[PDB]
Design a protein around this ligand. Structure first.
Ligand code: HEM
Ligand code: HEM
Ligand SMILES: O=C(CCc1cccnc1)N[C@H](CS[C@H](Cc1ccccc1)C(=O)NCCc1cccnc1)Cc1ccccc1
Ligand SMILES: O=C(CCc1cccnc1)N[C@H](CS[C@H](Cc1ccccc1)C(=O)NCCc1cccnc1)Cc1ccccc1
Lengths: 461, 461
């Protein structure tokens, strides 16, 4: 209990921390639930201890804007440290302060709406590959596991948009380029290893000296040379790698070759498990709400008659599609929490925040708060219609974060997912099976994933 | 050899580092000598590795000013980290960045020339106590160990100028207030413990979690309550404690009670072993250069006839006294090195310095460089006469450092030592004994102290 008396001093409420452990025994239900209960017992602001690390939760919308936007560069610039990360210290999502601001500048033009429009015909091709692999499992006439057919598509989109490799991953389950990227899995921070790091942060330097890394030494070594091969095989003869190779031919130093590999890995990590997981939560909400699934299939047939191919402009045209995606992200925000490290002794919105405190925003707990959402746990896509979309505080619904450090690929991800939904709904309908978990139970761990894999019926239109 | 390829890349020369150990095996001769040899083999700029920590030495005067003065706040603000320090993180000599700048502001008025003039009659009283204890060892007619009679005086000056306690330490060898302060000893950074920290910096966080501290848990606990007792016994009824208690009755927050204890300990640490050690090196240079000792005794008798008591104005009046003190500090600069941590990727005086590099200035090696000193190893106080004192680059001779982070007590220390020398030379002469080590050999460790304790003859005038 070295720093366990800080919140009691400031008068901030919170649960009682055990020595050394702090409040980590409360994670037995998961992040999403320890947050909802704390929002209940204590109100708009409270605190707790991840081991000896004090964490200050905030739920006031005006106070959130100061953290994420206003005092972002001056105060709350970096995320909660974690390791050992090895060379992935150069990834944008991990870099801090000034190294981060240089990386955010060198990679921001990579994610403009102009570059995204040139990636659309490439991503659309794997929508067609997604249909043929789903039509073979539809004539199978038995339940189809979503995260396998969506994982194959998300894998396909990543390998092509980031490196230019074009593989049918579902029909090439043993390709070298596919074998490595499947070993990249989302970090479970309530799992044994990362919990020990939370209680023993002093062990992080020991692991760094042993070259141990949370990113496996082999998948990283496979890409560190694949890039340097492609940087010397494409050279000389619209992928993320090309845009980064173009960037180092000009804040204010060019992207290094190892920094190039770091961002490529972070893009694969980001677009792989997120795209396939969100697409799973959407089809579960459509199969259990056939009214929604039918209405969306009709909007798709109006913009794209004769099962016409979707384009960049035809996708941004659909609004009920954007309503369904936003509503699913409300009930299942894959981030759950937003966090920033306080680097100074500052006073925001009338409250003293000392240096070293981790400020946290419980996104999951705010997405299901009745103070802003009518019938929160119900899947009602009408909240985001242009009639009611104005009653939504942009600092309560933050699926992609907010401020200068929000998700840099928010819009590649939306385009990637909407293109998949359109082609899938132009050829199939989705019914619930007997083994379909209803209602869906979230995993008690540190990931926003279903307890049991989603299984649905798939029929051909 | 994680970061052992940095200097080889930049083209900077330096000795070959072993894996993990780096260049630490070269410290078998000491700091002062590994520095002189490196100044020889490599020139004006070189580098080496304290374990995995790269250290860049610089010896160009214009490049030193940028580090210590110009880019001090922007780049080279903090010293080389070391621990575990516990609550002594709040000491000014240890605090970093903005916490340091706040502490330097709150304690700068404590060390003005105005406050020092009010401390003179107090310090002068223990000059008289120094004489009587030396006159009893003069009629003993046998060699007198200097660091025992000067340690008693330096102890006396510290307890009175910092807390107001007045003890004859040499005749009260068992006083509670004297027993604790004698347990404070200068850190030997070439000793087993601090060398292990250099090779295993990842062990510092482990020791911090076990409340282990390089400052003994007992001497610190004795002063942490002695202050809070005196802060409640003097309250309510010219010491360093009073000036700090006055400071917390006004950048820009008042001094905390624990921060008060931290600075008091750093003042005791500073003024104790330094004052007694420098006074030992001076009397050794006077006893082995009787021409100097006689000339100074005559200058003292001109300003202060009839063994008149020295005052603040009569001390600043003497110039040969100031010449002797400066020349002794040239041959024995107790700091040996000046160091700063580079916090940015900067380019100073036409050289790229990457982040995380420790910039080092070899003070001992520059004080004995023939490129600026004629006959460097000879004790010639005439270098600092107002005739030749202009041929001395203020960035080569830096016994008290330079820039915004120089020694805050440079001038309390000079006044403390000169007052002792005057009273001692007004009553005694110092002859060398048979056991007098001639020439004096410095210790092969990490401290600038004699191999054997200095022993001299003392006769009454
Ligand atoms: C449904 C899909 C996705 C969602 C919901 C999502 C959400 C988020 C959230 C909540 C953050 C943290 C924002 C904050 O801390 O304030 C974030 C950061 C980030 N995301 Fe995403 N993301 C998605 C997909 C992607 C994709 C496909 C990429 C591809 C490059 C990507 C790249 C990044 C990066 C680089 C960051 C860190 C930005 C920085 O630190 O400067 N994300 N995302
Ligand atoms: C012969 C006596 C002394 C000598 C030669 C000496 C020399 C030095 C040197 C070389 C430095 C480092 C400067 C740098 O890093 O640029 C320093 C720092 C310092 N000294 Fe002294 N010193 C002496 C006595 C004292 C005394 C009596 C005090 C009493 C308070 C004191 C207080 C300090 C402090 C607080 C610092 C750190 C300043 C900071 O980090 O802001 N020193 N000294
Ligand atoms: O720091 C923390 C908190 C540490 C902690 C917690 C509790 C206790 N003790 C310590 N967690 C994130 C840093 S690692 C993040 C992990 C990840 C998330 C989703 C999918 C794959 C991988 C990652 O690799 N992201 C790459 C890019 C990406 C991934 C997903 C969506 N968009 C973009 C912070 C973070 C969260 C979300 C998004 C980005 C970063
Ligand atoms: O950081 C370092 C380098 C660490 C390292 C080295 C090698 C390898 N790996 C790591 N060393 C100093 C920080 S501790 C200093 C120690 C000390 C010196 C003299 C007397 C008593 C105590 C201290 O307690 N000083 C208090 C005030 C004082 C003491 C003496 C003279 N004036 C003022 C830096 C420092 C040097 C000199 C002066 C101040 C600070």
């Amino acid at each position: 209990t070295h720093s366990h008396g800080l919140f009691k001093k400031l008068g901030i409420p919170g649960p009682t921390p055990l020595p050394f452990l702090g409040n980590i025994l409360s994670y037995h239900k998961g992040f999403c639930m320890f947050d909802m209960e704390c929002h209940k017992k204590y109100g708009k602001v409270w605190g707790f201890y991840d081991g000896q690390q004090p964490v200050l939760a905030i739920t006031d919308p005006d106070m959130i804007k100061t953290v994420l936007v206003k005092e972002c560069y001056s105060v709350f610039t970096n995320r909660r440290p974690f390791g050992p990360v090895g060379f992935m210290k150069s990834a944008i999502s991990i870099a801090e302060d000034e190294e981060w601001k240089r990386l955010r500048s060198l990679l921001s033009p990579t994610f403009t709406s102009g570059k995204l429009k040139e990636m659309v015909p490439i991503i659309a091709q794997y929508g067609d590959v997604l249909v043929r692999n789903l039509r073979r499992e539809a004539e199978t006439g038995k339940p189809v596991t979503l995260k396998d057919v969506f994982g194959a598509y998300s894998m396909d989109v990543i390998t092509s948009t980031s490196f230019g490799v074009n593989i049918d991953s579902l029909n090439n389950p043993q390709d070298p380029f596919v074998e490595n990227t499947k070993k990249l899995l989302r970090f479970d921070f309530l799992d044994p290893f990362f919990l020990s790091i939370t209680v023993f942060p002093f062990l992080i330097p020991i692991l760094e000296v042993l070259n141990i890394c949370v990113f496996p030494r082999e998948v990283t070594n496979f890409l560190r040379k694949s890039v340097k091969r492609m940087k010397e095989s494409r050279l000389e003869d619209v992928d993320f790698l090309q845009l980064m190779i173009d960037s180092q031919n000009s804040s204010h130093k060019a992207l290094s070759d190892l920094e190039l590999v770091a961002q490529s890995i972070i893009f694969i990590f980001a677009g792989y498990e997120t795209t396939s997981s969100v697409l799973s939560f959407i089809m579960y909400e459509l199969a259990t709400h056939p009214d929604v699934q039918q209405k969306l299939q009709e909007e798709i047939d109006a913009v794209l008659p004769n099962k016409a191919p979707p384009t960049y402009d035809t996708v941004l045209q659909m609004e009920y599609l954007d309503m369904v995606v936003n509503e699913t992200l409300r009930l299942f925000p894959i981030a759950m929490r937003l966090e920033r490290v306080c680097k100074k002794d500052v006073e925001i919105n009338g409250m003293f925040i000392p240096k070293g405190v981790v400020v946290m925003i419980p996104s999951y707990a705010l997405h299901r708060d009745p103070k802003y959402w009518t019938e929160p746990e119900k899947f009602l896509p009408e909240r985001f219609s242009k009639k009611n979309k104005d009653n939504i505080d942009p600092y309560i619904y933050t699926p992609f974060g907010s401020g200068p450090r929000n998700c840099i690929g928010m819009r590649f991800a939306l385009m990637n997912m909407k293109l998949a939904l359109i082609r899938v709904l132009q050829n199939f309908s989705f019914k619930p099976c007997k083994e379909t978990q209803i209602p869906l139970k979230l995993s008690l761990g540190g990931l926003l994933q279903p307890e049991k894999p989603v299984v649905l019926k798939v029929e051909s239109r």
